[PDB]
Amino acid sequence: LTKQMNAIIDTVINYKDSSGRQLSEVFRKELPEYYELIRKPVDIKERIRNHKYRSLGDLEKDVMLLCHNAQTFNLYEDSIVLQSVFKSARQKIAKE
Amino acid sequence: LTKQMNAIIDTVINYKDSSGRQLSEVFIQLPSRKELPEYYELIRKPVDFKKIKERIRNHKYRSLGDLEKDVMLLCHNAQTFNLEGSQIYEDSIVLQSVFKSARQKIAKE
Amino acid sequence: DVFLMIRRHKTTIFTDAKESSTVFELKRIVEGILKRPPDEQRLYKDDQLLDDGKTLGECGFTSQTARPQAPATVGLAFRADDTFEALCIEPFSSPPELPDVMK
Amino acid sequence: MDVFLMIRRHKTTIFTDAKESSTVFELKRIVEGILKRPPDEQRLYKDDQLLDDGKTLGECGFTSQTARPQAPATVGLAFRADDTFEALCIEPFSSPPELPDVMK
Amino acid sequence: MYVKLISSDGHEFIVKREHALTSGTIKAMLSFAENETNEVNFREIPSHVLSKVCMYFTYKVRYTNSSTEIPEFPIAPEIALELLMAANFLDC
Amino acid sequence: YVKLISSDGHEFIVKREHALTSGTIKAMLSGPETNEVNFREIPSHVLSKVCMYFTYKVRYTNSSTEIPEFPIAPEIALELLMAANFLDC
Amino acid sequence: MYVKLISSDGHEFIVKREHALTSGTIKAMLSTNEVNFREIPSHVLSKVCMYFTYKVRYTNSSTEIPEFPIAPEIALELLMAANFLDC
Amino acid sequence: MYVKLISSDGHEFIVKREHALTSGTIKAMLSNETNEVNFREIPSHVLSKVCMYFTYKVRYTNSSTEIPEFPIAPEIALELLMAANFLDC
Amino acid sequence: PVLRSVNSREPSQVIFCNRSPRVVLPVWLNFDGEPQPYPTLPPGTGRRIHSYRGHLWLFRDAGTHDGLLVNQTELFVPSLNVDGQPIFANITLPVYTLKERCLQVVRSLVKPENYRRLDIVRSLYEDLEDHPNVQKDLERLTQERIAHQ
Amino acid sequence: VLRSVNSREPSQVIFCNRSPRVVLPVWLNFDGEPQPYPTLPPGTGRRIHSYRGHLWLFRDAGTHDGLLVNQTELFVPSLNVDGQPIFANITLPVYTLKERCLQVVRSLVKPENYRRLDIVRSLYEDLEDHPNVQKDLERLTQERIAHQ
Amino acid sequence: PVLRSVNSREPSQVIFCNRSPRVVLPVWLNFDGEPQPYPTLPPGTGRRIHSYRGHLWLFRDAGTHDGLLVNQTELFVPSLNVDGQPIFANITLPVYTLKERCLQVVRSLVKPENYRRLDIVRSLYEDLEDHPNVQKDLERLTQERIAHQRM
Amino acid sequence: PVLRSVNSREPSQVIFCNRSPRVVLPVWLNFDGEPQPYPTLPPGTGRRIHSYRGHLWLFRDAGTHDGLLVNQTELFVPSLNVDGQPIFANITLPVYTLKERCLQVVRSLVKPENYRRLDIVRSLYEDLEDHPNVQKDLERLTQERIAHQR
Numbered sequence A: 001l002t003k004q005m006n007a008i009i010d011t012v013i014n015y016k017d018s019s020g021r022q023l024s025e026v027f028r029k030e031l032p033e034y035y036e037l038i039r040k041p042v043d044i045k046e047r048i049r050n051h052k053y054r055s056l057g058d059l060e061k062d063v064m065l066l067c068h069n070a071q072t073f074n075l076y077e078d079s080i081v082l083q084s085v086f087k088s089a090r091q092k093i094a095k096e
Numbered sequence B: 001l002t003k004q005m006n007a008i009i010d011t012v013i014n015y016k017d018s019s020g021r022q023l024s025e026v027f028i029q030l031p032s033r034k035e036l037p038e039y040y041e042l043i044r045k046p047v048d049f050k051k052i053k054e055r056i057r058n059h060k061y062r063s064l065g066d067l068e069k070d071v072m073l074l075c076h077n078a079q080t081f082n083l084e085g086s087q088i089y090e091d092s093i094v095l096q097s098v099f100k101s102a103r104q105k106i107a108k109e
Numbered sequence C: 001d002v003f004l005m006i007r008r009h010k011t012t013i014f015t016d017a018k019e020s021s022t023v024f025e026l027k028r029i030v031e032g033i034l035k036r037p038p039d040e041q042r043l044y045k046d047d048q049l050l051d052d053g054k055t056l057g058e059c060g061f062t063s064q065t066a067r068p069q070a071p072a073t074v075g076l077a078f079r080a081d082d083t084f085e086a087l088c089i090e091p092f093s094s095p096p097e098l099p100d101v102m103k
Numbered sequence D: 001m002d003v004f005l006m007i008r009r010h011k012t013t014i015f016t017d018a019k020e021s022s023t024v025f026e027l028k029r030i031v032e033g034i035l036k037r038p039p040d041e042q043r044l045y046k047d048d049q050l051l052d053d054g055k056t057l058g059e060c061g062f063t064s065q066t067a068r069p070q071a072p073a074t075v076g077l078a079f080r081a082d083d084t085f086e087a088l089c090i091e092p093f094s095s096p097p098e099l100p101d102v103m104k
Numbered sequence E: 001m002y003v004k005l006i007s008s009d010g011h012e013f014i015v016k017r018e019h020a021l022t023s024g025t026i027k028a029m030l031s032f033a034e035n036e037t038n039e040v041n042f043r044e045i046p047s048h049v050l051s052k053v054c055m056y057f058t059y060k061v062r063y064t065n066s067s068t069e070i071p072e073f074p075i076a077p078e079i080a081l082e083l084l085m086a087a088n089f090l091d092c
Numbered sequence F: 001y002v003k004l005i006s007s008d009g010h011e012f013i014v015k016r017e018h019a020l021t022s023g024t025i026k027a028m029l030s031g032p033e034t035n036e037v038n039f040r041e042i043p044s045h046v047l048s049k050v051c052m053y054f055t056y057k058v059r060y061t062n063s064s065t066e067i068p069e070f071p072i073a074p075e076i077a078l079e080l081l082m083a084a085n086f087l088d089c
Numbered sequence G: 001m002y003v004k005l006i007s008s009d010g011h012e013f014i015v016k017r018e019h020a021l022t023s024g025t026i027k028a029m030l031s032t033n034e035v036n037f038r039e040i041p042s043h044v045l046s047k048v049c050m051y052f053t054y055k056v057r058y059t060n061s062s063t064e065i066p067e068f069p070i071a072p073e074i075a076l077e078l079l080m081a082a083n084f085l086d087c
Numbered sequence H: 001m002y003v004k005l006i007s008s009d010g011h012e013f014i015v016k017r018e019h020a021l022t023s024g025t026i027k028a029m030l031s032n033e034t035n036e037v038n039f040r041e042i043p044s045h046v047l048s049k050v051c052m053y054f055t056y057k058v059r060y061t062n063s064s065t066e067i068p069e070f071p072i073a074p075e076i077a078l079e080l081l082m083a084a085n086f087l088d089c
Numbered sequence I: 001p002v003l004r005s006v007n008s009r010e011p012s013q014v015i016f017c018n019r020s021p022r023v024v025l026p027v028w029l030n031f032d033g034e035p036q037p038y039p040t041l042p043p044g045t046g047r048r049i050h051s052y053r054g055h056l057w058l059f060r061d062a063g064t065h066d067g068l069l070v071n072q073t074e075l076f077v078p079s080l081n082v083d084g085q086p087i088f089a090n091i092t093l094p095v096y097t098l099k100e101r102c103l104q105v106v107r108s109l110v111k112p113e114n115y116r117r118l119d120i121v122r123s124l125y126e127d128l129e130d131h132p133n134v135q136k137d138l139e140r141l142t143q144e145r146i147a148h149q
Numbered sequence J: 001v002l003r004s005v006n007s008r009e010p011s012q013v014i015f016c017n018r019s020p021r022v023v024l025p026v027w028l029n030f031d032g033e034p035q036p037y038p039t040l041p042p043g044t045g046r047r048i049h050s051y052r053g054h055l056w057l058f059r060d061a062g063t064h065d066g067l068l069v070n071q072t073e074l075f076v077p078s079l080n081v082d083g084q085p086i087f088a089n090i091t092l093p094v095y096t097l098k099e100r101c102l103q104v105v106r107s108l109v110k111p112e113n114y115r116r117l118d119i120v121r122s123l124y125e126d127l128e129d130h131p132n133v134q135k136d137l138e139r140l141t142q143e144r145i146a147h148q
Numbered sequence K: 001p002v003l004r005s006v007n008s009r010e011p012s013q014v015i016f017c018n019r020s021p022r023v024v025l026p027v028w029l030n031f032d033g034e035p036q037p038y039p040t041l042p043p044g045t046g047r048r049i050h051s052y053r054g055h056l057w058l059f060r061d062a063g064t065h066d067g068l069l070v071n072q073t074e075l076f077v078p079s080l081n082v083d084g085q086p087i088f089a090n091i092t093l094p095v096y097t098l099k100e101r102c103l104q105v106v107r108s109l110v111k112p113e114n115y116r117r118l119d120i121v122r123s124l125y126e127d128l129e130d131h132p133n134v135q136k137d138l139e140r141l142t143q144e145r146i147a148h149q150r151m
Numbered sequence L: 001p002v003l004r005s006v007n008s009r010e011p012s013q014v015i016f017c018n019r020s021p022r023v024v025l026p027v028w029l030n031f032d033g034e035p036q037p038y039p040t041l042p043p044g045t046g047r048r049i050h051s052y053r054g055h056l057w058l059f060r061d062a063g064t065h066d067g068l069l070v071n072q073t074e075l076f077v078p079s080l081n082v083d084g085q086p087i088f089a090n091i092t093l094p095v096y097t098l099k100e101r102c103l104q105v106v107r108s109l110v111k112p113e114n115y116r117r118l119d120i121v122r123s124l125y126e127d128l129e130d131h132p133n134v135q136k137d138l139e140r141l142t143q144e145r146i147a148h149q150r
């Protein structure tokens, strides 16, 4: 399960779009506005080593929370693509 | 001598103007180059008021004329970098005038 | 700064555009959405045809009568061959008679 | 913009800057600060014309292109004696020696 | 990119996707998880209501985080109850 | 402000900071502060221009746009060079 | 109390004393409930009063002040009257 | 290499061919090819300035150096705008 | 004591500006943190009010007790005056949820004893009956401050 | 005397233009030189990132006429409390009838034609004396040396 | 959003040099790619400004909203700073079409409500009334980027 | 060789803009850090030039060999171009010391064989004779660059 969870999280990070740029690169003193508007902050592998996620549906629940807490704060599309590249990366590793 | 160097340097730092505000508050510790790169490119010899007490704790200063030479250097470093008539500019003009009256009281009385 | 409902038959498009923008630019926005080119679309404010060259402002649409909560209605007609389709905006469902509780 | 000035009365010459937008009055106040005489005891002239306290240096004629730091524009100064104001008198600077034949 | 909301009596409403998402129920319905759905159909919401629900999306999107002054979102008595129903169902 | 006095006896009132551009003036003022300094061998037409440089240097140091040439007429060139050398600048 | 301003054409304008005093020149003249302006017509002196109303009401009003309108047709004569009055 | 533009009042303007071609309308009228073109509704004080623009455009297009404002006096502005649109300059 | 005024002893001049269409009830939290009703501001009015610094305020529709905003937030605490300048409290409508807004309108048209006559779900009936309330909202605001801490 | 203070502490502010005019926000820099900033259309408001102790001033972008912010002439944001933004309410002052008339005449007549108006010579000078940030800054200084 | 700044957190010192005769409005495109007005540059001045790597800028006549150029192009994106040396943004007039230039002059002489009174063709009146605009120009610049990224 | 071009093989389009009154001599440092004279820019002229990323340039008064500045600094090194947009090298007069500026003027008016006729100090005569020089200045810049800061 840990080998599968790493394959899915590393594919989403290593994923470059069709201009060659890596999307995941972006991911209180600095920006207090995120630390006022977003409820449940995160910056993910830590909880794969500590085994806090019990299934591949618990790893997904907090990747959607991180991608959705990005969409909330900024008036964005890469967190729309990182949800679409996580939902295709989990669908290849977990069933093939 | 080290006690007088501590007195002269501590009087200039502790010195408040006639509205109650301490002037040395900005001159205590310099900014990181990451923070303000233009200052480092403009200023040959970045020195602050801790870098001077550090010298004094090491007693790096030899005479009271060597302690003065580097208090004039930072106070003049500030003037070069800042706009004329800025908050920080006219206080390095006062910190040179409060150091030249503080050394004149301790070194001869 | 102008809020609009562009309605043809049973279709209603909710969109904004500038007072200074032109009837033509609006046709282009419709083209972008409904994939129907600018020259076969005919846009009406009430019962008057709008010239592609006039600004929405000069047609009569203003910020104070085209607010987001009360959008101004631009009527839309398409072209089949030579003829012009009639300005037909089939009305919305009707609200029930005011309940006796509120009188 | 910035205008660079020499305010000169007799053998006194004050070097100072101001804004095109700043006024003849505030310039009198700068002089007050240095020569300790209020604006109502001072007359400021551009060449031979008197300058009204209310006009901006710009309007008086001091442009950025005639009041450059290395070619400061000269404002003449006169002080009041009782009922009358002294004549505008600007003692000239020392003459340079005839151009040496080496530089010809 | 736009989205199509279809009333009970079968009126079509084309509104910006982001405008529509202001509704939790709609967000849920839009967000087979390979690609996006343009249509959503409301069996029990008539046009005169769903029209006004859109007008709210327009309002909310525009005036959220606008600094000096916001105007009250008007609701006529005639529509109030059915809108309240629709509102609660939509989560807007 | 500070007062610079030429040989012929003209008085030049210039900002202290402007004057300090001259290492030699810095020395004369910083070593006993007084307001006056007297140049027995610098005439006015020269010391006037020396001030004009202070104005120039102070203003155009650290200027992003573009800097204009500090002009020196032949007639004054030699005496200015002398004065310039005697002053740090 | 109230005070009576009389225009060239002989219209009478009854305005509160304090409203009128907004004019230094009136303040001077009342320092007497009457003043006669031989060179100020009514369409002007009428508007001069309207300003007193405005100034008195909106001075020290925190939320918002509305622009005191002056039509082109009246602008010059009002400017004249304004300067004479010191309002 | 040169081409003749003739104003309503009948002034002749001899300008490089390539300078003139900056105008679509002229490009069309010339595209063998003729030497003269006559503008019956464009006066000289206007067609003169239209040429001056050709000179300007040709020279300052693709210049790394700062470009200077192409001046137009109020008295000429409207007729130039008319001429400009007809020419496609 | 979480959400409360502070005994600063330092007066702060403030301008309450009501840019809402509603009659506004200014609500001063006392030192114990108990809401204290103050005189109402008519729509489109502004007043200079003597206050003290660190004092915590809150605004509401005097009629419906609906939630308002001050400087695009929920609480207003005056800063110490700088050079005599009066601090400004700009009171506005928030963007109410469509639901909450509808409730407002229904509540305003139907007598509370007739909420029972509306052909709506019981949960909606309970929501209508629930009228907005300073205290309920204060409790919520504290949990939102212990969730940031 | 009248200048911003280099602070390092951010102060978010809301510029609210409740004048009928286009408003020119004017930030005094550290040396105390007016710096024009982007204009606010009438009836608009923006959140702007400024710093504690920074001194601002507002004016009619078109005429350079004087405006007011929170019933005074200068605005200096206090330190933010709990992150909430400070508010700068920009409004017309009550202009003197004279100054107001000048405004209107100035707006209708080209400056070269002020000479054609059948008015007193003093008024010509008044018309020509257009309002100005610097003139007003000089006045505000003497009004602060008079309070000391 | 094809044309937008990129959040980088790596600072890039820049020099905005206004070599136009006009007052210049620097316009920073934010991360969403919405124009953000910044303080104006008077004609013939230069200022050192703090921007970040990848941040996209645009310049305009603060008055007329007329289009300007920076380093003989329309957009400026600071290069990574090397050795502390500041990058330079040289802002100038473009070569306006004679028409567009004439419009500029007419627009500058006639009050907008009077454009209607000019004894010219309606099409010219429409052109006069079509004030230049950052957003219109941004839309055009996008299609001009998808046209050299089509091929 | 501390101060030298770096063999990049990545082209960098640059605009040399001469905003000095002086005729400008662009000087390209070679990879062995050797000054290489290039064609002169007339006053008030701007040219697009083909250079490479990391290449180090320096500018001077083609006549007097007086020091100039590019982008407020002594050395110019082109960044890699973004989106083909050309980099800009703005060449300007520096704030010369009054002395050095005077020397410039005297040197320009008096033939070098006549420096001996000027009633000045011998040290000043040596300073007059000591023409400014790219190599001397490069040596200075290295010691100021070997000090991590300045």
Ligand SMILES: Cc1ncsc1-c1ccc([C@H](C)NC(=O)[C@@H]2C[C@@H](O)CN2C(=O)[C@@H](c2cc(O[C@@H](C)CN3CC[C@@H](N4CCN5c6cc(-c7ccccc7O)nnc6NC[C@H]5C4)C3)no2)C(C)C)cc1
Pocket (backbone or CB within 6 Å): A026, A027, A030, A031, A042, A043, A066, A069, A070, A073, A074, K007, K008, K009, K016, K026, K028, K038, K039, K040, K041, K047, K049, K050, K051, K052, K055
């Ligand atoms: C005088 C004069 N005259 C003429 S012009 C002028 C002038 C010149 C300059 C200035 C002033 C001083 N300078 C400026 O105005 C400059 C100019 C222009 O270039 C923009 N800019 C700015 O200041 C913007 C600015 C600052 C900034 O610095 C970043 C550290 C800020 N960050 C990135 C944007 C946020 N993001 C932070 C991650 N955050 C997310 C993080 C994560 C995440 C990360 C790691 C792990 C897990 C995670 O989930 N996820 N999602 C995120 N989404 C949101 C994102 C936001 C902070 N960058 O830009 C200012 C204006 C915005 C003035 C005048």
Ligand SMILES: Cc1ncsc1-c1ccc([C@H](C)NC(=O)[C@@H]2C[C@@H](O)CN2C(=O)[C@@H](c2cc(O[C@@H](C)CN3CC[C@@H](N4CCN5c6cc(-c7ccccc7O)nnc6NC[C@H]5C4)C3)no2)C(C)C)cc1
Pocket (backbone or CB within 6 Å): B026, B027, B028, B029, B030, B031, B035, B036, B039, B047, B048, B049, B074, B077, B078, B081, B082, B088, J006, J007, J008, J009, J015, J025, J027, J037, J038, J039, J040, J046, J048, J049, J050, J051, J054, K036, K037, K038, K039
């Ligand atoms: C859209 C719209 N519509 C209507 S208006 C508008 C709009 C409005 C604004 C903006 C833009 C985005 N915002 C602005 O323009 C705002 C506004 C106004 O508030 C000023 N400002 C600015 O941006 C200035 C500005 C920014 C800044 O930030 C400092 C904290 C950063 N500084 C380095 C860190 C500290 N310094 C640290 C070293 N310290 C020094 C120390 C020493 C020293 C100490 C000891 C020993 C020796 C020493 O030498 N010396 N010098 C020092 N100098 C710096 C000092 C503090 C602060 N500050 O100001 C910018 C523009 C100038 C956009 C749209």
Ligand SMILES: Cc1ncsc1-c1ccc([C@H](C)NC(=O)[C@@H]2C[C@@H](O)CN2C(=O)[C@@H](c2cc(O[C@@H](C)CN3CC[C@@H](N4CCN5c6cc(-c7ccccc7O)nnc6NC[C@H]5C4)C3)no2)C(C)C)cc1
Pocket (backbone or CB within 6 Å): L007, L008, L009, L016, L026, L028, L038, L039, L040, L041, L047, L049, L050, L051, L052, L055
């Ligand atoms: C009109 C006007 N007005 C005012 S100015 C001006 C003007 C300006 C410019 C130009 C013209 C068009 N442009 C130029 O002149 C430009 C400008 C300036 O930027 C340099 N440059 C040039 O053309 C040099 C140039 C350099 C270079 O890069 C290599 C790819 C070209 N060659 C292939 C291969 C390489 N060599 C690289 C080491 N290599 C070896 C390395 C080693 C080695 C290295 C490290 C450690 C150990 C080692 O052993 N060993 N052996 C090597 N042998 C092979 C050698 C190959 C050079 N391209 O061009 C030119 C002048 C040199 C016109 C007008």
